[model samples]
Target: LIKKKNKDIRIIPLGGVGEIAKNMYIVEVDDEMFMLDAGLMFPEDEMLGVDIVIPDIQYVIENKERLKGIFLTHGHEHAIGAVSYVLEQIDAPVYGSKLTIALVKEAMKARNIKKKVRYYTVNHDSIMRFKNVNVSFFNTTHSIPDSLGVCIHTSYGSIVYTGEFKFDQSLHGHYAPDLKRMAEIGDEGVFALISDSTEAEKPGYNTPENIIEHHMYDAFAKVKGRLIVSCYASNFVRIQQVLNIASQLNRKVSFLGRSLESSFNIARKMGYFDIPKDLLIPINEVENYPKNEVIIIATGMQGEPVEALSQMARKKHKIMNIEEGDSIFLAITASANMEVIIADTLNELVRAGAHIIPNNKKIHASSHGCMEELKMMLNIMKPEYFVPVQGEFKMQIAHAKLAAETGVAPEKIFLVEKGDVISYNGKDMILNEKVQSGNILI
Candidate 1:
């Protein structure tokens, strides 16, 4: 263990600010350092044949010995996708909730990373201590189960990081945010607050999951032919809803895509999904069932050409092909850079004479909070300084303005990009330094 040199807190944005993915952050106190997330982003059109992009993380590689742990917030690709790659260089214990750990383990197994890395299973109330610093977690509502916000109790005060969340009172069980614990942390005293800036430009709150479930049920009930749906692989809430709907409609369900099928099996084994055993059918056996009795859940919500949805659209899938009477439902909207790809996929489906169900707002909802929810979080945390993360520059600026409205001084609110550092010298939070931070193609 390294000896303490001084009492100073530094917050480094390795990624996830000024972009929509590849979220990684580092917190340094005295001689100890830890990371919040290690995620990857999908490649853009200009990226050519590159499959994915991860944070450069040169700084972490440079200070590998001082790194104590890596704490993950969720199981989404943009939250835990790069764990195996990062662990290849830095040997540190990784911490996440049960479901999150399962996903990470599965990904690592796929990559054949057999070297044993310390894995710790943490829950909403679990607290961990390293040297004199303490770290705690709180539940947060997102598209997946076991999502959490983080609190780092430092020498100065608590640094609160609100991982992607929305304040939806209608959600219950694992889907609910822990407001009581959040308020208690605020009461104890918060030095700075870092929050998700995604959906910050939107005016009101996000559409709750229950309403989306209702609309999905309606769409499923109306389908008279083979129904196929595409969504993000990690959106367990949406996958669970589809399973419930298929059960209610007395339809046989089949999963497609490698990642989607793997996630389904892993979550089912861990008791994270309430799927009816009898309703599941092998993807190859879908042809044996009647057309009206089948519901297939697959990936390619963003229109990636090699995914299941696009394969079906092009009539290239091995098992099932898109037919004239098939109903295709897109359970997710395209990202900013995916519009053209999605359009091409849609055009191919139309050419095959299939019924296309667009990504209607009523059927799909984002997990991120909008302006009203952001305002509510700021008021609850009441932090001395605010940092907007998890979105682009405009969204960060919009979040900064919202924090200003909540009484955080304009100068105290920081709209920083990736690699920018904010430090606290036991007194003031200041913009201090920059490190080697960018994207690494994989």
Candidate 2:
């Protein structure tokens, strides 16, 4: 068992370093402990028929009673996908913003887990105290809506974890990172900072959402046939934009794929999305709508073989059919082996008498914070110590370089792997121990 100290905070990365999936982290101080972002990774071909890979929460299982809560940074699969698997072993309260809780509820329902999950609603600029620590959640922009950057106030000092984020001045309407509040917190003094490192290697500013909007609109204007757009279901903001545009053009909207349908139901019920009732049509009614007056939002932008778009590409969807004069819009950013799979799928769609939009059209945008924005955030927050979380080894290294450039010392910036324990005393941070942690394929 790990010993508790009064003025120390112990951090453990259960996953999400030197890799792109299965993000988990543990934070402990005094007798209280908390977790952030329990997620899973998609199985690669070499995994040999594995469905999903979740982090092995052996450490938490061993110290179950010490866990105070499981705090989610967002609703993305890379953020909260492993909740069911982890909850099977640990029974702690789950806290997240509105959308995150909604998604988690859906995930639990899908898994048919009977236990009641204790959930706490969090907002962009609110604080919740867990034991002696003051936990604050800050709204940040990401590919998915309702992502947060958390600030933990411990006895020694405050530690900030900036979850996936970006700086988009043009898209500053609903949920933008509160730079003012972050600056204020920095002024008060931040002891350490853990941040997203996915896009750390990318130089300069991130591409704005408006650029993608323009590209999509131009593509839509050019297409003279039925349009089918595929993206992540939880990206309600992007879905809303697509629906709004389609509605304005008097096109009937039909949702495809089970995941997309499920997310749409949840988002609509939670008031996060508003679609005109008359403009939406059921899959069975697709044949009744005019070809140019139809828009189908779907899943399988990643070319998952069983997803709706992929099935359609293989000529297998029952209700809706793709034929000559149809346009397929790929509306999600490519990641991992997705580019090659999507290209192959597009070729298959073309053979089935449909035109596919190229990635060069800029219809998709990434959710993670870009390099300059990460640097700017670090410089402003100026946390004394740094830990890079939520990406592969190169991503972590790039972020560490940014932290170094922002005045954090190299020794103070830790590039930790999964299962590594990092302890912080009142004066310094040190590597304490290494626990068993890896992906559990299920």
The best candidate by lDDT is: 1
- Whole-model alpha-carbon lDDT for candidate 1: 0.83
lDDT, model 2, position 33: 85
> lDDT values of the candidates?
0.83, 0.78
Q: Which pairs of residues collide in candidate 2?
A: 143-367
Off by over 4 Å in 1: 1-6, 257-260, 300-302, 305-307, 358-364
**Would you list the clashing residue pairs of candidate 1?**
none
Q: Write the per-residue lDDT of candidate 2 for residues 38-133, one digit (tens) a residue.
A: 888877556346568899888888889899899898888878989988888878999898888998999999989989889998986677876658
TM-score of each: 0.94, 0.93
Q: How well does candidate 2 score on lDDT at residue 9?
A: 81
Q: Tell me the number of clashing residue pairs for each predicted model.
A: 0, 1
